[PDB]
Each structure stands twice: as structure tokens, then as C-alpha cells.
Amino acid sequence: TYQYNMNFEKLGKCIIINNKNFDKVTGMGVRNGTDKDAEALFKCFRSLGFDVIVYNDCSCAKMQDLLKKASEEDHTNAACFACILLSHGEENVIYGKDGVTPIKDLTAHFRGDRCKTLLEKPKLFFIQACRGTELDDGIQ
Amino acid sequence: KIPVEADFLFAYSTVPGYYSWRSPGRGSWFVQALCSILEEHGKDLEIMQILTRVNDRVARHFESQSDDPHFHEKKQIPCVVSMLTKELYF
């Protein structure tokens, strides 16, 4: 009674956005190693039971359309939704192939009033990106 | 009636204001750890137990290797943001 209901026909959809290459105009360099990440994530989340789809080097338009389209799907027989974002980023924003888009713009499609079929179901967002330019020197 | 901003969870690879680290040869620290934990305990632990164990792994088992004395021997701690109203098991 204190756990999310999992008795559904499928665990849910999982969208992986894998941004490796960026337009010169962004001045962002190649994210070498992210291909290793995306396939690893692919193996793990399909193992959990997600029906996972990978997209590469998405534009901001592409990223917005992807999650919006997903939010307009029928999640009646899904237990949850998950989205993994692999890209460059700064505070509150994430880099697309052609520029930046705020993360809250991307996840707002899955708000309770905009995605009824995912209501009272967990919406998971995993984000691999910078959130600023401070460094953690650590200590022992 | 329930809040529209409810039942979200944000697993950030790092805290606000801070850099996120990646190894060109093995991948980003966060995703490496995340996948490692999810392979072992993905089906027998609650999601917050999993992410807590991810936080621990990134903090301890990673240290930046860099040319630049400004970017060398640096650390990272991920950042979990939960708006969940129940426990999550896969």
C-alpha cells in the first residue's frame, strides 16, 4: 500500500537521448564515451522491463517533440515512464544539437494535468550533464 | 485531487552549480555507477536505495585524471530530487 502499483501489462516506455555531436555554433566539443553509456543504459533498462528507444544527436526541436509525443501516448497499461538525458548542460538547461533548452520545459509534458495516463505513476528523469562550472576538490 | 508536479523523480549526475565528469574511454561516472548498481540490485531494491548506492559509488570510486592542475584530482557527488509519493520497486 506504500509502494507504487506495478500490476500492469508492461513496465513502461524508456526514452534515451544520446547527444554526442553538436553544431560548431554551440562551441561544444564531442562527448566521447557517451556511446558506451547509451548502450549500457539500453541493456539495463530493458532488463528492468522498459521498452527502451534510443535517439542520437537530437536538436532541441527534436527533444521537445520526442517527449511531447511520448506524453500524448496511451500509458494506461504502463506502470511508469523513464527518460535518460545524456548531453552537455548548464544550470537548469540541457544542450541539444543546435542550442539549449531548459530541463523544466522538457519534463513539463508529463505533469499530471498534461499527461493523465501517467497520473499517480512515477515519472523518472535521469540527467547526465553539467549544472555549472564549480569544481569539487573533495577531502579525506 | 493531487498536485500536477507530483510523482516526479530527478536523478541528476551532480549537484547544482557543479561540473559533471565523463571518461572518454569508459563513459560518464554517473552512468557507469548507475548501470553497475542496476545490474546487481535493480529488481530487489527500492529506487531510493539504488540511487543512494549510486551516490556513494560516484563519491568514492572516482577521481578526475586531467592535464590541467585546475581540473586534476577532482570529485563528484550526484543529486537525487524526489517528488515521489510512494516507494518504487521494479
Partner: peptide
């Protein structure tokens, strides 16, 4: 090692 590179940053994001």
C-alpha cells in the same frame, strides 16, 4: 577526463 572531460567535463559536461
Amino acid at each position: 577526463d572531460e567535463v559536461x
